[PDB]
Amino acid sequence: NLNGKTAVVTGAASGIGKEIALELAKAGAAVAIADLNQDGANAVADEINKAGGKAIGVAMDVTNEEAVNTGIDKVAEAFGSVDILVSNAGIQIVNPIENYSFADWKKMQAIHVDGAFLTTKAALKHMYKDDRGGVVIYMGSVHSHEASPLKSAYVTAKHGLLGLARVLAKEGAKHNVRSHVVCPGFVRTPLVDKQIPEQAEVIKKVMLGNTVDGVFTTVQDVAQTVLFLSAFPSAALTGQSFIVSHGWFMQ
Amino acid sequence: NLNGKTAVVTGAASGIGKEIALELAKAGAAVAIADLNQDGANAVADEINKAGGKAIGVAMDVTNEEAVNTGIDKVAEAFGSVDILVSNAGIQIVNPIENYSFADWKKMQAIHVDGAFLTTKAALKHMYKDDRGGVVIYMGSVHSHEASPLKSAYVTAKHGLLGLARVLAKEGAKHNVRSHVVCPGFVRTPLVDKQIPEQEEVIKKVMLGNTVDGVFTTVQDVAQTVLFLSAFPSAALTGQSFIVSHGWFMQ
Amino acid sequence: NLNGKTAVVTGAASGIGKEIALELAKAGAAVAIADLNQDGANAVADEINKAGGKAIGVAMDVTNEEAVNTGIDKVAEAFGSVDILVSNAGIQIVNPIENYSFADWKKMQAIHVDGAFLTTKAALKHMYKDDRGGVVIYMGSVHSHEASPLKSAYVTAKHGLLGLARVLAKEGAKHNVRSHVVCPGFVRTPLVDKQIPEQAKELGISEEEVIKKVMLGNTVDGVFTTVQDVAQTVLFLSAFPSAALTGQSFIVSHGWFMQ
Amino acid sequence: NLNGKTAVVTGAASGIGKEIALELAKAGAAVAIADLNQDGANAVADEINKAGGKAIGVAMDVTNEEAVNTGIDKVAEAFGSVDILVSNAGIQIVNPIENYSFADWKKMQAIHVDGAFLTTKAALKHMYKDDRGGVVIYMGSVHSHEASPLKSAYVTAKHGLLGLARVLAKEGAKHNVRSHVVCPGFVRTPLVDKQIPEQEEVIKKVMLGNTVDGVFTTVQDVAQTVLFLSAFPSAALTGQSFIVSHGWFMQ
Numbered sequence A: 001n002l003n004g005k006t007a008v009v010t011g012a013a014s015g016i017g018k019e020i021a022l023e024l025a026k027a028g029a030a031v032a033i034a035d036l037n038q039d040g041a042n043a044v045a046d047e048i049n050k051a052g053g054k055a056i057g058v059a060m061d062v063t064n065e066e067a068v069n070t071g072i073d074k075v076a077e078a079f080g081s082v083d084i085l086v087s088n089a090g091i092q093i094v095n096p097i098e099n100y101s102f103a104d105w106k107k108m109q110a111i112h113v114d115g116a117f118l119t120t121k122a123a124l125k126h127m128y129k130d131d132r133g134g135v136v137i138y139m140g141s142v143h144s145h146e147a148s149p150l151k152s153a154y155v156t157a158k159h160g161l162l163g164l165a166r167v168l169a170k171e172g173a174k175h176n177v178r179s180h181v182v183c184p185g186f187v188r189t190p191l192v193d194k195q196i197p198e199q200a201e202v203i204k205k206v207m208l209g210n211t212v213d214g215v216f217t218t219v220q221d222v223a224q225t226v227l228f229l230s231a232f233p234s235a236a237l238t239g240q241s242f243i244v245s246h247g248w249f250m251q
Numbered sequence B, D: 001n002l003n004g005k006t007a008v009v010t011g012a013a014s015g016i017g018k019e020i021a022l023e024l025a026k027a028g029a030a031v032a033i034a035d036l037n038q039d040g041a042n043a044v045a046d047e048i049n050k051a052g053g054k055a056i057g058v059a060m061d062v063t064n065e066e067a068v069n070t071g072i073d074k075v076a077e078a079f080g081s082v083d084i085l086v087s088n089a090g091i092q093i094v095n096p097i098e099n100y101s102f103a104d105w106k107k108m109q110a111i112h113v114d115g116a117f118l119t120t121k122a123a124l125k126h127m128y129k130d131d132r133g134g135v136v137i138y139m140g141s142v143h144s145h146e147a148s149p150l151k152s153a154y155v156t157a158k159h160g161l162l163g164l165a166r167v168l169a170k171e172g173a174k175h176n177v178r179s180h181v182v183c184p185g186f187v188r189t190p191l192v193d194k195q196i197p198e199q200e201e202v203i204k205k206v207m208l209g210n211t212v213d214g215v216f217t218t219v220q221d222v223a224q225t226v227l228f229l230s231a232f233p234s235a236a237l238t239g240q241s242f243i244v245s246h247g248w249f250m251q
Numbered sequence C: 001n002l003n004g005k006t007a008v009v010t011g012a013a014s015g016i017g018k019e020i021a022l023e024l025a026k027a028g029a030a031v032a033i034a035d036l037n038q039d040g041a042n043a044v045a046d047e048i049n050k051a052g053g054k055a056i057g058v059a060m061d062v063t064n065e066e067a068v069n070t071g072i073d074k075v076a077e078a079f080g081s082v083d084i085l086v087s088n089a090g091i092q093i094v095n096p097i098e099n100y101s102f103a104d105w106k107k108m109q110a111i112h113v114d115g116a117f118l119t120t121k122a123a124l125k126h127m128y129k130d131d132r133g134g135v136v137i138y139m140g141s142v143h144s145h146e147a148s149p150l151k152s153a154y155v156t157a158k159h160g161l162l163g164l165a166r167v168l169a170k171e172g173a174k175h176n177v178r179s180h181v182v183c184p185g186f187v188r189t190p191l192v193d194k195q196i197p198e199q200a201k202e203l204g205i206s207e208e209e210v211i212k213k214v215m216l217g218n219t220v221d222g223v224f225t226t227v228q229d230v231a232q233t234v235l236f237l238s239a240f241p242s243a244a245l246t247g248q249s250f251i252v253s254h255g256w257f258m259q
Ligand SMILES: NC(=O)c1ccc[n+]([C@@H]2O[C@H](COP(=O)([O-])OP(=O)(O)OC[C@H]3O[C@@H](n4cnc5c(N)ncnc54)[C@H](O)[C@@H]3O)[C@@H](O)[C@H]2O)c1
Pocket: A010, A011, A012, A013, A014, A015, A016, A017, A034, A035, A036, A037, A040, A060, A061, A062, A063, A088, A089, A090, A091, A111, A139, A140, A141, A142, A183, A184, A185, A186, A187, A188, A189
């Protein structure tokens, strides 16, 4: 139960972030949907508010320090606190290393890694006040732990998020701030639903051959894990990553 | 919510297992407490039954194949299924390697490793029937992932449990069986009580000095994690270990 | 270079252990080949001696405490010390967990895990003497770190060896003893050259497809690990001038499982 | 035996990189000393040339794409190939996350992570030619695997390097290119030598308390591990990281 808590989810206009925001709101949290896509952010907030929850849409480029600061402070002013941060905005750009654009490389690191750093820095200024505390969750991937070809930038970024979370777990403990990384496997999306006919079988072998059961991870799987971490009564799980992938990479 | 589910918890006359049995029963599971200490198992069962739950005590030396098979079959006949196995019974025997008796070594592997193997094998015969499925949770340790001196036998066995669980995740998938390993940090139980005199200085420094916050893990921390895994709606977390240790070893 | 050092390699009558013994001896170590197969152990020792090295064969069941203690003390009396222990004897027995024989389970843990414990403890009695020191290497597997179906006993044992080695690294430090685990991918030993036509027939696919897709599908390059790959890693660990690598495992698998 | 091989070591005007360059040269490789500090790079090269080896100094800001491309092409021009890349240049900047400068954050990412990416990409243009092959080694840290407070930027970067190396191992294999990450523990440097009297107690407790033996890692430890990887006869070790830390973090 998260009644009375406040959450900000970046990238929540779509996909995994959207489901996380809907389920945190369903659990009683007030939720700020932060996204580059301001229209989509407002659509999610207006869905939560029409269901009886409390939500705001926040226009936020997570690569832009001042926009991140302004958006996080806006959440704290609207809701009174920033108790849960889910750093989730992301994109994918594929190429082999020898033809990988350096501009693409930096954009990938800025969205995935700098966005996590910047939103964490802005949130901690609130969570640390009077040691109120907080939960900070980064959206990793099985690619935080394992590589695939053509994804050097993404894999590098998702690996780096583990390091940031592990430092935060150490620094944040004295202020009652916990850190975690959630690492989904392959989530079936509308784009995946178009590739399955295109690529062709593809499901169980090409896409999910590295799972134990050939089953896609769902946005519900991810959000339920986020809610469990967000509501956990102690700091016992701080610093840990959680692989939600149907057995693709086991630790 | 575990209404309609059946669970066997080995080692549940005491400590971590006892809390797991009580919390599983409060969630609506019928619970079999299986323990070398049959009187203690009966006492936990009586506590559950007096509170409105459903439980039985089972005599079970988990090193003894007949006792394991008889006990699991008893649960299945009493409750109709064996849906959740928590393999938790364990002891600690401390000595440097050069003074570690081979008798102690084998006893440690028999209780920790053979006990997990024997109880899993017996439970799978029930869980695999008509692919009913199941959840198998091994009680590991931060010592499944990291070593301490004087604990060669224990650390070896706790490391071995990860291997068994990861194989079960692969084998069990086609029968809807999941596997997990829970890895607590220090928890105040008789297993800890018996060590400290041999070794508040040992507690705050030697033990809790590995955590980020200086806090013992509680039996509630562990049981809440077991309940989360037990109720999870898909197999997305299968094969994974969960470190519940307040930041002692981060993966 | 290992001149003046003594090494004991268990399971070295054949395969990976045999190659480790030959390369340790070529580097200057006096090598004892400890194996259930006494003729095969004497054969490897004689191959070393004829090439100008120094070696003996030692009959040893690594599951038996008396045999291990007697054999290790024999090496110490023959060569003067026991500086390097390579715990390598193994066995594979496959079955799904729900039909895994407990007799076979106990045999798998006795050979892999008890063998490592017993030989380690016997060797420490010499290595700890006057804090002389030593290097203890366990032969693990990619299956020390990752699972495959039907191999519960093997995977559990190989995972456990990591734990033993990590404890030894902590306890052994004050006596100048280091520990490591070497983790090969698939190597073309006899038991494996048998697996390949057997798996081909059973899976109904070509032999090349068993190699490239089933056995080596998780490597980056489709290449078997060689006995030379493993032995050169053991040589490097054995001669390393400091304890900097103690407690670590080394995956020698052409990219199957990366840490 | 690296006779006839060519190597480039970034950051090799000083410290770990310098010892690596000296030992690669002593093993018979031609060595380019790439460093921001051109004075120091020329000095190491001159040390090598006076001892009978072959070396060049290369002024190279590893954060700058043009400087990296021009520098690596100069090595291939001078020596005929680029067979070994050691990506080693680094810097450390400490601060808690909530006070951390984004300017420092970006500098840390640029040197540690962008430098690895840019030097790798430039080297592959040469190593992939006719599948000649190559060895690419990133200098990580125990902080590639484990966190310390105040080092968020550094720990994040060093964790990210594992991801990049793991992708390179998969992509490079078809071209005979291997990747590794070498992870030194605490290396005693002149700066360390003036902190011990500032703080044989600070050594074994504050600095080396997390080692098993209280021994500093040496530059020789690191360079010997680099030489072993550089001469390995097969790709068997590709994608792996090597912890050279006297037991601080065990995998
Ligand atoms: N989909 C999967 O299979 C999968 C698997 C593992 C991990 N992940 C991770 O989960 C997270 C969410 O992924 P998704 O699949 O739901 O993606 P998505 O494309 O559905 O949603 C991504 C959202 O991020 C927003 N965004 C992009 N750049 C932004 C920026 N600069 N500032 C703010 N918002 C920005 C987009 O506008 C969009 O709303 C990502 O971090 C992704 O790497 C996804």
